[PDB]
Amino acid sequence: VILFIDELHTLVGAGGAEGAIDASNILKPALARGELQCIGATTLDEYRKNIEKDAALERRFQPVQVDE
Amino acid sequence: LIGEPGVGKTAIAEGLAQAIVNNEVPETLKDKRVMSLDMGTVVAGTKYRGEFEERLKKVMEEIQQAGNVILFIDELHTLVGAGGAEGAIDASNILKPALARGELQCIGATTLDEYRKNIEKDAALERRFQPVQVDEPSVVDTVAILKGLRDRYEAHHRINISDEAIEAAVKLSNRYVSDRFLPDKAIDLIDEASSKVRLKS
Amino acid sequence: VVKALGNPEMNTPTLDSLARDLTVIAKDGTLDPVIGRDKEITRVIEVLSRRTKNNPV
Amino acid sequence: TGVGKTELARALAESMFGDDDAMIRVDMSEFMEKHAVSRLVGAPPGYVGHDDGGQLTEKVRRKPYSVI
Numbered sequence: 001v002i003l004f005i006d007e008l009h010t011l012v013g014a015g016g017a018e019g020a021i022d023a024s025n026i027l028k029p030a031l032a033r034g035e036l037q038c039i040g041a042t043t044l045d046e047y048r049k050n051i052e053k054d055a056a057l058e059r060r061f062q063p064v065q066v067d068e
Numbered sequence: 069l070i071g072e073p074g075v076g077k078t079a080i081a082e083g084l085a086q087a088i089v090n091n092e093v094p095e096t097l098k099d100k101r102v103m104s105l106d107m108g109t110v111v112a113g114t115k116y117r118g119e120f121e122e123r124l125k126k127v128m129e130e131i132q133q134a135g136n137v138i139l140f141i142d143e144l145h146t147l148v149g150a151g152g153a154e155g156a157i158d159a160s161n162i163l164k165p166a167l168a169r170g171e172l173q174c175i176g177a178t179t180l181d182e183y184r185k186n187i188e189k190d191a192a193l194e195r196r197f198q199p200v201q202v203d204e205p206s207v208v209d210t211v212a213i214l215k216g217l218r219d220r221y222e223a224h225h226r227i228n229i230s231d232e233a234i235e236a237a238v239k240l241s242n243r244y245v246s247d248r249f250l251p252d253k254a255i256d257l258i259d260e261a262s263s264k265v266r267l268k269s
Numbered sequence: 270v271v272k273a274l275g276n277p278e279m280n281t282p283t284l285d286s287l288a289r290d291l292t293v294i295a296k297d298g299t300l301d302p303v304i305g306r307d308k309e310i311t312r313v314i315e316v317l318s319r320r321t322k323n324n325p326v
Numbered sequence: 327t328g329v330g331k332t333e334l335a336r337a338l339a340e341s342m343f344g345d346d347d348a349m350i351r352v353d354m355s356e357f358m359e360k361h362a363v364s365r366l367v368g369a370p371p372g373y374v375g376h377d378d379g380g381q382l383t384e385k386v387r388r389k390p391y392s393v394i
């Protein structure tokens with residue numbers, strides 16, 4: 001199974017609550033260890049705004065540039 | 069373990085585990101179990117009241133009885149507020165009494181930013197942990213790391229990696245990649261080049 | 270009638286309930302064709318074939 | 327005036343990338359005010375758009391090999 005997560009900027013904070021664990025923290029070990037093949041799609045602004053704050057999560061993804 | 073993402077704090081923990089397996093330098097750690105705890109696993113399946121509390125408490129009692137377990141909590145900054153609720157207690161306040169009395173030996177792993185924002189704000193939790201700075205390895209150190217890891221990546225990609233490739237990867241990633249840190253970017257360069265040459269044939 | 274029309278002999282259920290299978294949708298033929306993106310698709314394949322983090326964004 | 331120094335920059339950008347629009351152009355004429363430097367390095371700390379960062383910084387980071 002290859003996983004495609006469109007709008008990857010929604011990964012951070014997804015499912016967070018007063019005492020819950022968000023999706024990014026859960027998925028970090030699998031993403032780092034090459035266990036889950038995740039394809040993400042997001043814009044430059046959304047990437048920088050959401051999934052560059054989490055430097056560890058940014059480290060776990062390889063950006064592919066889609067030019068006009 | 070304090071360091072920027074990609075330096076290898078988790079690698080430090082796994083190296084400690086491998087050293088324990090082969091030959092631990094001291095006696096007192098000859099027969100120890102290093103167990104990696106994930107807060108998502110602990111919080112999961114605790115939909116009823118206090119199940120998180122009983123689960124973590126049972127974990128702590130089992131640690132106390134066994135006496136040969138070193139708990140490794142990756143992403144230590146996630147310990148604060150975990151499993152909390154409108155009137156419940158987070159995992160950090162559960163672990164504080166055990167750490168203070170001395171029943172728990174924990175190995176944390178967080179970057180400088182998360183450590184400073186989350187752990188330093190609490191004096192009780194901060195006074196039980198000693199930061200161990202993990203610095204970015206040098207160019208020669210990164211070359212040694214890549215040479216050590218060469219076998220696994222060659223096995224995965226079924227190609228041969230030359231020493232000149234290692235040198236070029238580390239030097240070019242040092243000079244032209246700025247947002248990441250030496251071991252991670254050198255490894256990524258090697259891995260992507262290997263995948264490229266494997267896909268071409 | 271339903272039994273006569275049916276099967277007399279009567280592995281990732283959570284993901285199937287949650288996600289959409291783009292492969293069966295491509296088999297159906299409802300996805301639009303993609304033209305002239307060979308280099309980007311090749312790069313995606315290269316990132317997907319890595320040993321360490323193989324997650325292209 | 328009229329002597330082609332800007333046109334030289336456009337020609338260099340075209341030769342090095344293939345199009346004039348690949349050049350990163352920052353007209354200094356809109357930086358007359360002292361606080362207009364916020365468009366280059368971002369809003370001062372504690373202000374509204376402080377976390378967005380500078381526009382020129384992000385454009386250069388996206389294209390480390392360009393003409394400014």
Ligand SMILES: Nc1ncnc2c1ncn2[C@@H]1O[C@H](COP(=O)(O)OP(=O)(O)O)[C@@H](O)[C@H]1O
Nearest residue numbers: 056072073074075076077078079213217251252
């Ligand atoms: N001495 C080393 N030997 C082998 N691999 C290493 C070493 N140091 C770092 N690494 C690599 O660096 C990565 C560890 O990154 P890490 O800092 O744990 O990420 P995070 O900070 O997001 O947890 C591992 O994938 C590992 O392959």
Ligand SMILES: [Mg+2]
Nearest residue numbers: 077078142177
């Ligand atoms: Mg880690």
Ligand SMILES: [Mg+2]
Nearest residue numbers: 330331332333
């Ligand atoms: Mg001019």
